[PDB]
Antibody, heavy 228, light 208 residues
Framework: QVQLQESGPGLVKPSDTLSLTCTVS????????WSWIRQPPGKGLEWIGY???????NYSPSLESRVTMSVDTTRNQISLKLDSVTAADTAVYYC???????????????????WGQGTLVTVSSASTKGPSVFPLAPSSKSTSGGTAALGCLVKDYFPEPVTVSWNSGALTSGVHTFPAVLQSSGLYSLSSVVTVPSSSLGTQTYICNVNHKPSNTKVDKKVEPKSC | YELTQPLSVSVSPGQTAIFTCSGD??????VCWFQQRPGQSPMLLIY???KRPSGIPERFSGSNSGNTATLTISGTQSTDEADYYC????????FGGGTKLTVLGQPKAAPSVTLFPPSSEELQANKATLVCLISDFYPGAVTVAWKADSSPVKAGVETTTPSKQSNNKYAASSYLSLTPEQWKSHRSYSCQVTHEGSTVEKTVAPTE
């Protein structure tokens, strides 16, 4: 299975050179073109450039003087570098595969046919801050009848993103993780809740797994199933 | 070179949604289409005008000739709600600005509201956050106000814009930051959620 993984999300200082890597597994670089495509928050898609392993890269005319890409066939990686970043470069950066076929008198890219999950790059001079995670205990007052809700509050982190799983992914049903609020302080908070049947509550443990890659922090907070 | 796509397209449930993408002599080029569901990576739907990769059902089809390319979704479902991008190559890669698909004719749904008091661990850290989680509402717009006892609170409130959940209803959250002393000082706090002209309120009070 050919899978694409971008290097982890985080901060870059204004004016610095952004450096990203895409690691390809489940097959070799050599068969495909490799591109980077980015998406600023609330905006559309912007192609940055592509490369073939034995060819020369080609870049967007708009980014050409600031970007480069290269391929390392022994680590099976593609890199991106982007000079002089500003807040306009804050975006999700996707590593993107394109198939190669012959048509219209050349070998050509035919389709952006496999996209990575993307890595969120936030351009800021501020420092990172990991989350403080607090348990949200279940209430003995169901409002829907027959169910309890318990959760994790993930407080005051920077930058985005944070991901949350429950019981290492073994718990999925009734899980609801809310998008983060941006506070006036410029920090983020979010919440994740699990709804579970009343009759079911306390028959196992509930652990929220909170991942904040920008600070290389992970928290596993156990929520004791006790109402007050 | 530019590709022009409308900002949004809407459809009633189970029926046919048509997306247009225009550009000068677009028919001379090959067009691809991508779908991007909220909070996910784009995914290829159509390549070379009308070909489907294996995971794309036959109810998606593409066409391209003259100055216009189209994407057609038949039997459209709420879970097809997404941004749809067209794309081509003209000396360089060009993406359209994207079209947001809304599936209308959905029944209204009142918000479910869950309000959590500050945890004991947070209070011991000398902080206090009330958490008002709001889910399962349609249409996707609410306003949220807070009260300390019966009085309006302005300071310390942070509220998200609503976002789509997986069952196709919407969710939002709102937070009230207090000092431990403010939390313990009042008889109660309430999160009031207004949806389509009517309001649900939940209340919590210091315990233990």
């Amino acid at each position: 299975q050919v899978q694409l993984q971008e290097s982890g999300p985080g901060l870059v200082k204004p004016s610095d050179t952004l450096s990203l890597t895409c690691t390809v597994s489940g097959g070799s670089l050599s068969s495909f073109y490799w591109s980077w495509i980015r998406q600023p928050p609330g905006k559309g898609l912007e192609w940055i450039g592509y490369i073939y392993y034995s060819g020369s890269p080609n870049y967007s005319p708009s980014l050409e003087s600031r970007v480069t890409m290269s391929v390392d066939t022994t680590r099976n990686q593609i890199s991106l570098k982007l000079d002089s970043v500003t807040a306009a470069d804050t975006a999700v950066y996707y590593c993107v595969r394109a198939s190669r076929s012959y048509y219209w008198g050349s070998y050509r890219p035919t389709a952006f046919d496999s996209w990575g999950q993307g890595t969120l790059v936030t351009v800021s001079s501020a420092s990172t801050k990991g989350p403080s995670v607090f348990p949200l205990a279940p209430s003995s007052k169901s409002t829907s009848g027959g169910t309890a809700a318990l959760g994790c509050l993930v407080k005051d982190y920077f930058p985005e993103p944070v991901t949350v799983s429950w019981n290492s992914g073994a718990l999925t049903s009734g899980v609801h993780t809310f998008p983060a609020v941006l506070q006036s302080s410029g920090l983020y908070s979010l919440s994740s809740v699990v709804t579970v049947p009343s009759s079911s509550l306390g028959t196992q443990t509930y652990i929220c797994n909170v991942n904040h890659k920008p600070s290389n922090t992970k928290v596993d907070k156990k929520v004791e199933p006790k109402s007050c | 070179y530019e590709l022009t796509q409308p900002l949004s397209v809407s459809v009633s449930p189970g029926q046919t949604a048509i997306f247009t993408c225009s550009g000068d002599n677009l028919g001379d080029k090959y067009v691809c289409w991508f779908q991007q569901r909220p909070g996910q990576s784009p995914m290829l739907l159509i390549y070379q005008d009308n070909k489907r990769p294996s995971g794309i059902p036959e109810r998606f089809s593409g066409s391209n000739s003259g100055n216009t390319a189209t994407l057609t979704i038949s039997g459209t479902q709420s879970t097809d709600e997404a941004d749809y991008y067209c794309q081509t190559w003209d000396s360089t890669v060009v993406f359209g600005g994207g079209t947001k698909l809304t599936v209308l004719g959905q029944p209204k749904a009142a918000p479910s509201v869950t309000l959590f008091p500050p945890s004991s661990e947070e209070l011991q850290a000398n902080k206090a956050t009330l958490v008002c989680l709001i889910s399962d509402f349609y249409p996707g717009a609410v306003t949220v106000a807070w009260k300390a006892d019966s009085s309006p609170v302005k300071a310390g409130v942070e509220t998200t814009t609503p976002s789509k959940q997986s069952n196709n209803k919407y969710a939002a959250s709102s937070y009230l930051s207090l000092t431990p002393e403010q939390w313990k000082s009042h008889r109660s706090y309430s999160c009031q959620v207004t949806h389509e002209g009517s309001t649900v309120e939940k209340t919590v009070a210091p315990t233990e």
